[PDB]
C-alpha cells in the first residue's frame, strides 16, 4: 500500500524481441529510480536482463518463429512455408502481430493485471494484446512508441486483426485507426522527422530515444586497431531484418574499403554458412551496441528503429537495407534529414554497397545531417524528466 503518485506499481509490457523491449527500458529504469515498483512483461528470454535492472520480470507472448507457424496453419493449412510465393507469405504478419500474439499476451496479462493491480500500464505500441488487457481491466494506460509513425498498409492490416480480436473479446474499439487506444502517447522519434499529422496528435509527449545501456564489454580488438581509418559497423538486427546472403554481400562490399569492419549478426541470423572473411572484418555474435556507436564512422544495417535512432543519436551516417516492417519509414526519415542513404532489396551487392559506403564516408553532408538530429535528440526530454508525468497519467 502506497500513497498517490509515490512508489507506484507500473506495468511495462512489450513484444518479446529486442527491437520492441529495449526502447522501453530507459523509461522503466527512470521509473525505478523515482521509487516506483517496475514489473516488466515480455519474452522470458529477457528475464535475466530485467532482474538485473531491478525489475520484476513477467513472461508473455512467444518467439516470432512460433507466431508464423501458427499463422501459417491458420491461413494456409500447412506447417511449412515451402511452395508459398512471397506474396502469400506477406499475408501472415497481420495474423501474427494482429491476432496470434495479441491473443496470447492478452490471455497471460489478464490474470497478471488481476493480481498486480497496477496503478499504470506502459504499453509498447505494437503490443496490442497488452493494450486490450489493460483496457478491459480499466487500468490507466499510456502508449510507448518504438519508432516513427507508420500509416501504411501493413499497419492498417494489423490493426484490423486487432479490431477483430477486440470484438471477440467483448471489447468494442472506436472506429478508425487504433491510435494507441486513445491513450497518452510517448513518442521517442525525432519530432522533425516524425510524420507531421502524428506530431500534432493531442496528448503526445516527447521522450529522448535513449539506447539501452548494456554493461557488456566491447570487442578487445578495438583497443589496438588503426584509429586513423574509419570504423564501420554492420548489423541486420535481431529479427528477420535481413538475410545471410545480404550480410555476405555487405561484407564483400565493405571489406574492400580501407577500414575496420565490426559485424554483429545477432541471435536469430544463422551465419554458420557465412564463410571466410578478410582480417579487417571481425564477426561478433552480440555487442554492447550503445557503447560501440560513439566509436563508429558509419552504421550499415537493416533499417530497424533501434539502430536507426541509435546512429542518429550518435551523429553517425547510416546506410540501410530496408525490407522489413518500418525499415522503409526509417529510410525516408534518414533521407529527409540527409543523415544517410539506402539500397533497395534488388540493389544489394558488393559493388553497390562499396560505392554507397564510400560516399557516406567521404561526403561530409551525410555526417552533418546525422549530427543535426543528434543535437535534436539530445535536446529532447530525458527519461528522468518524462517520468515526472507518470503520476499524472495514473491519476
Binding-site residues for dTDP: 238-239, 286-287, 289, 302, 305-307
CA dist., res. 349 & res. 386, Å (int) = 43
Taking residues 309 to 348 in sequence order and writing x for each that binds ligand TYD by CB under 6 A, - otherwise, the string is ----------------------------------------
> At closest approach, how far in Å is the CB of 242 from ligand TYD?
9
Toward ligand TYD, which CB reaches closer, 241 or 253?
A: 241
Residue whose CB is less far from ligand TYD, 253 or 266: 266
Of residues 14 and 37, the one with the C-beta less far from ligand TYD: 14
161 to 220, contacts with ligand TYD by CB under 6 A?
212
Residue with cell 545471410: 244
Q: Do 27 and 386 touch, CB atoms closer than 8 A?
A: yes
For ligand TYD, which stretch binds (CB under 6 A), given 115-123, 137-145, 158-166, 304-312? Answer: 304-312
Site string for ligand TYD, 210-249 (x = CB under 6 A): --x----------------------x-xxx-x--------
Give the chain's length: 395
**Among 280, 286, 338, 359, which residue sits at the site for ligand TYD (rule: CB under 6 A)?**
286
Residue 126 interacts with ligand TYD (CB under 6 A): yes or no: no
State which of residues 8, 41, 207, 287 lies at the interface with ligand TYD (CB under 6 A).
287
- Pick the closer one to ligand TYD by CB: 181 or 212: 212
Binding site: what residues are annotated? 238-239, 286-287, 289, 302, 305-307
Q: Which three cell numbers stand for residue 32?
A: 525505478
User: Quick one: cell of 389?
Assistant: 508525468
What is the rounded CA–CA span in Å between residue 246 and residue 191? 31
Which residue in 49, 127, 194, 305 binds ligand TYD (CB under 6 A)? 305
Q: 20 vs 367, which CB is nearer to ligand TYD?
A: 20
Rounded to whole angstroms, how far apart are CA atoms 206 and 187? 5
Task: Tell me if 43 contacts ligand TYD by CB under 6 A.
Answer: no
Selected range binding ligand TYD among 87-95, 224-232, 305-313, 381-389, rule: CB under 6 A: 305-313
Buried b (16+ CB within 10 A) or exposed e, 283-320: beeebbbbebbebbbbbbbbbbbbbbbbbbbbbbbbbb
DSSP string, 245-263: HHHHHHHHHHHTSSSEEEE
Helix (H, G, I), strand (E, B) or coil at 296: coil
By CB under 6 A, name the one of 289, 318, 320, 354 that touches ligand TYD. Answer: 289
Binding residues for ligand TYD, rule CB under 6 A, total 19
Nearest to 309 by CA among 276, 340, 268: 340
DSSP letter string over 164-202?
HHHHHTT--PPSS--GGGG--EEE-S-GGGS-HHHHT-T
Nearer to ligand TYD, 14 or 183 (CB): 14
Q: Which set of grid coordinates corresponds to residue 350?
A: 558488393
Distance, in Å, from the CA atom of 115 to the CA atom of 229, rounded to the nearest integer, reads 56
Q: Which residues bind ligand TYD (CB under 6 A)?
A: 17-19, 22, 212, 235, 237-239, 241, 264, 266, 286-287, 289, 304-307
Amino acid at each position: 500500500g502506497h500513497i498517490e503518485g509515490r512508489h507506484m506499481r507500473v506495468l511495462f509490457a512489450s513484444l518479446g524481441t529486442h527491437g520492441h523491449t529495449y526502447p522501453l527500458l530507459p523509461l522503466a529504469t527512470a521509473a525505478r529510480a523515482a521509487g516506483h515498483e517496475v514489473t516488466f512483461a515480455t519474452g522470458e528470454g529477457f528475464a535475466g536482463t530485467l532482474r538485473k535492472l531491478g525489475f520484476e520480470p513477467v513472461a508473455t507472448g512467444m518467439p516470432v518463429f512460433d507466431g508464423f507457424l501458427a499463422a501459417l496453419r491458420i491461413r494456409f493449412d500447412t506447417d511449412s512455408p515451402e511452395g508459398l510465393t512471397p506474396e502469400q507469405l506477406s499475408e501472415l504478419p497481420q495474423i501474427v502481430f494482429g491476432r496470434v500474439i495479441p491473443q496470447r499476451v492478452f490471455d497471460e496479462l489478464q490474470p497478471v493485471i488481476e493480481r498486480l493491480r497496477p496503478d499504470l500500464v506502459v504499453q509498447e505500441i505494437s503490443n496490442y494484446g497488452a493494450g486490450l488487457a489493460a483496457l478491459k481491466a480499466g487500468i490507466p494506460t499510456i502508449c510507448h512508441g518504438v519508432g516513427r509513425d507508420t500509416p501504411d498498409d501493413l499497419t492498417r492490416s494489423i490493426e484490423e486483426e486487432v479490431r477483430g480480436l477486440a470484438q471477440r473479446l467483448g471489447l468494442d474499439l472506436p472506429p478508425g485507426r487504433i491510435d494507441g487506444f486513445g491513450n497518452p502517447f510517448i513518442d521517442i522519434f525525432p519530432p522533425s522527422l516524425q510524420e507531421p499529422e502524428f506530431r500534432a496528435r493531442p496528448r503526445r509527449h516527447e521522450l529522448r530515444p535513449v539506447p539501452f545501456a548494456e554493461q557488456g564489454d566491447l570487442p578487445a580488438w578495438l583497443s589496438s586497431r588503426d584509429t586513423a581509418r574509419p570504423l564501420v559497423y554492420l548489423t541486420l538486427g535481431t529479427s528477420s531484418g535481413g538475410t545471410v546472403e545480404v550480410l555476405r554481400a555487405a561484407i564483400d562490399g565493405l571489406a574492400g574499403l580501407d577500414a575496420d569492419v565490426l559485424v554483429a549478426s545477432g541471435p536469430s541470423l544463422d551465419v554458420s554458412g557465412l564463410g571466410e572473411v578478410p582480417a579487417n572484418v571481425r564477426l561478433e555474435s552480440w555487442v554492447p551496441q550503445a557503447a560501440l556507436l560513439p566509436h563508429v564512422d558509419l552504421v550499415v544495417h537493416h533499417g530497424g528503429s533501434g539502430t536507426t535512432l541509435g546512429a542518429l543519436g550518435a551523429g553517425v551516417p547510416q546506410l540501410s537495407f530496408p525490407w522489413a516492417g518500418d525499415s522503409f519509414a526509417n529510410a525516408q526519415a534518414v533521407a529527409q534529414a540527409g543523415a544517410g542513404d539506402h539500397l533497395l532489396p534488388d540493389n544489394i551487392s558488393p559493388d553497390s554497397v562499396s560505392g554507397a559506403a564510400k560516399r557516406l564516408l567521404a561526403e561530409e553532408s551525410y555526417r552533418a545531417g546525422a549530427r543535426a538530429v543528434a543535437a535534436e535528440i539530445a535536446a529532447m526530454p530525458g527519461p528522468d524528466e518524462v517520468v515526472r508525468l507518470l503520476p499524472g497519467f495514473a491519476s
